[PDB]
Amino acid sequence: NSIQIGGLFPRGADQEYSAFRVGMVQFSTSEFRLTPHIDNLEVANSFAVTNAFCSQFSRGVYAIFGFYDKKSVNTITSFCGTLHVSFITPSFPTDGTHPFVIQMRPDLKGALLSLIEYYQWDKFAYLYDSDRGLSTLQAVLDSAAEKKWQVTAINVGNINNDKKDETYRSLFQDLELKKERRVILDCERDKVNDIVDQVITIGKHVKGYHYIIANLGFTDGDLLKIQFGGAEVSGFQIVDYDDSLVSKFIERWSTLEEKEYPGAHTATIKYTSALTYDAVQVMTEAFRNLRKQRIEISRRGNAGDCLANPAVPWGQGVEIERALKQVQVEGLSGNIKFDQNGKRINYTINIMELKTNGPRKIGYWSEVDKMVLTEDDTSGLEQKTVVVTTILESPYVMMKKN
Amino acid sequence: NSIQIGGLFPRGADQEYSAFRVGMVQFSTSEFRLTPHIDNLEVANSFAVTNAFCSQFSRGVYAIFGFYDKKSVNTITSFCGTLHVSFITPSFPTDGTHPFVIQMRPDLKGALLSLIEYYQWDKFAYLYDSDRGLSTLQAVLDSAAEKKWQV
Ligand SMILES: CC(=O)N[C@@H]1[C@@H](O)[C@H](O)[C@@H](CO)O[C@H]1O
């Protein structure tokens, strides 16, 4: 029953962890029940990640669930490659094929490239943050030559917070040199709200400007401050609140007490936390399929010191990989299915534009069909005031007497 | 007075290791010396670098000369940054202020940003590989808007 797993959670991720415990209750059965070992660490420091991963490998876990930053992702991936320990995470996908990793986050690259091709953009800005890797940036730069775009790529990530008001105003005066009106905010939701706060201050949110929020959590941030500005805003949504399964989860989620489960009394859930809840369901059904297939997975003895030289890989970790990558269930992220590399496949991402009446589902793409949604004939406000420009020159346009 | 040192060298790098051996003989003095432990490894595997760093730390070296890739660099920086071990490298610099690291290679990007200015280039082609990295590519793109370049 007690199947041991390793848990690595950042120190600022409250809702992301509280989503893990709710998954532990919803998916626990009488056949068996997972026994997590949790340690809160600074995810950026890779030595602590190395120390914590070895702190789990010694205790004899069968799988590990955690996170990584740009600095620490290499530590996880290579340790899990030689030790055959399976790793499930909601953090960004690796920049290539890495085994013994189960990346719950879907590949956003195919969404953004297509979304730009829908709007027929041939010149746009792209403010990226290295915190989530430059895999998305390498794609737009690669596709810049095929479709003859002219990208204005600015590493907005490396900035300090005490000179933040001076440099952000200094940034848009550089974006003003080309008269740029098409920006892509490839940042995490926190930096987005920091950018959006400065966009209103200088006043670049009026009729004409068009932004893209290039992350899976469009509705997760605060969007009411540029909703009435007039500038069109796009984004991506993976946590579909239209579906019934989520509507059931939100009912139970909306009621819970916020003292025991921090960050849970709201009506929405972050795409990080939502994937955590679904990550439990993958680890559940994986060991469940290990029972039905009659496979022995318990450790023969002590795992030992992780720095084992020569390197010792336990053979029964392979079947845990093969069982994890055969899971095909339904959750908050639509269909959840994994390829031989652990990348999400068969998935569905919604495209949301911000209008006057709040968020609105307008499009969706798939790894086999792009930009399909036809059509959003329902809803619809039917309101528009066209802007006509002219010049005061007689007799075409003259001011009246009174 | 035999001082012990951690030596981290990749496999395909032979002349680099040659130069290290030459430097020791040229600078070794009569009253103290450098006693290196040389772990030849593949620099890309983060576990290997971790495994090799601890083999040097347990042997009790006083400083470590080595290299790093795009992947393994963060393994070195945090490991030395917490253990206070000194690391000396000719690999490309750290994108930031990481202590206990001695970067022998100087900052090339500032020079390239200036040379492009001298030739008065306004549109050009930039070729790069993701293996070495992209910090210079981040730099040319950082000043492509500021200086009106069509990269
Ligand atoms: C070919 C295939 O497997 N299609 C499935 C579809 O049947 C299912 O309704 C949906 C759930 O979101 O996920 C898709 O991947």
UniProtKB/Swiss-Prot annotation, chain A:
Where does it localize? Answer: Cell membrane; Postsynaptic cell membrane; Postsynaptic density membrane
Extracellular side: which ranges?
1-402
UniProt keyword terms in alphabetical order: Cell membrane, Disulfide bond, Glycoprotein, Ion channel, Ion transport, Ligand-gated ion channel, Lipoprotein, Membrane, Palmitate, Phosphoprotein, Postsynaptic cell membrane, Receptor, Signal, Synapse, Transmembrane, Transmembrane helix, Transport, Ubl conjugation
Q: Which GO terms describe its cellular component?
A: AMPA glutamate receptor complex; asymmetric synapse; axon; cell surface; dendrite; dendrite cytoplasm; dendrite membrane; dendritic shaft
Record PTM: Palmitoylated. Depalmitoylated upon L-glutamate stimulation.
> Which protein family is named in the record?
Belongs to the glutamate-gated ion channel (TC 1.A.10.1) family. GRIA2 subfamily.
The protein's job, in short, is:
Ionotropic glutamate receptor that functions as a ligand-gated cation channel, gated by L-glutamate and glutamatergic agonists such as alpha-amino-3-hydroxy-5-methyl-4-isoxazolepropionic acid (AMPA), quisqualic acid, and kainic acid. L-glutamate acts as an excitatory neurotransmitter at many synapses in the central nervous system and plays an important role in fast excitatory synaptic transmission.
Additional free-text comment from the UniProt record? The postsynaptic actions of L-glutamate are mediated by a variety of receptors that are named according to their selective agonists. This receptor binds AMPA (quisqualate) > L-glutamate > kainate.
Q: This protein is called what? A: Glutamate receptor 2
Q: Which organism is it from?
A: Rattus norvegicus
Q: Which portion of the complete protein is shown here?
A: 25 to 432 of 883
From Swiss-Prot, chain B:
- PTM notes: Palmitoylated. Depalmitoylated upon L-glutamate stimulation. Ubiquitinated by RNF167, leading to its degradation.
Q: Where in the cell is it found?
A: Cell membrane; Postsynaptic cell membrane; Postsynaptic density membrane
What induces this protein's gene, according to its Swiss-Prot or TrEMBL record? Down-regulated in the pyramidal cell layer of CA1 in the hippocampus by global ischemia.
Q: In which tissues is this gene expressed?
A: Detected in forebrain. Detected in dendrites of neuronal cells. Expressed in the pyramidal cell layers of CA1 and CA3 and in the granule cell layer of the dentate gyrus.
Q: How does this polypeptide assemble, per the annotation?
A: Homotetramer or heterotetramer of pore-forming glutamate receptor subunits. Tetramers may be formed by the dimerization of dimers. May interact with MPP4. Forms a ternary complex with GRIP1 and CSPG4. Interacts with ATAD1 in an ATP-dependent manner. ATAD1-catalyzed ATP hydrolysis disrupts binding to ATAD1 and to GRIP1 and leads to AMPAR complex disassembly. Interacts with GRIP2. Interacts with GRIP1. Interacts with NSF via its C-terminus. Interacts with CACNG2, PICK1 and GRIP2. Interacts with GRIA1 and SYNDIG1. Part of a complex containing GRIA2, NSF and NAPA and/or NAPB.
Q: What does this protein do?
A: Ionotropic glutamate receptor that functions as a ligand-gated cation channel, gated by L-glutamate and glutamatergic agonists such as alpha-amino-3-hydroxy-5-methyl-4-isoxazolepropionic acid (AMPA), quisqualic acid, and kainic acid. L-glutamate acts as an excitatory neurotransmitter at many synapses in the central nervous system and plays an important role in fast excitatory synaptic transmission.
Family, per entry: Belongs to the glutamate-gated ion channel (TC 1.A.10.1) family. GRIA2 subfamily.
Please share what else the UniProt entry notes about this protein: The postsynaptic actions of L-glutamate are mediated by a variety of receptors that are named according to their selective agonists. This receptor binds AMPA (quisqualate) > L-glutamate > kainate.
Domain comment text? The M4 transmembrane segment mediates tetramerization and is required for cell surface expression.
Write the protein's name: Glutamate receptor 2
> What is the organism field in this record?
Rattus norvegicus
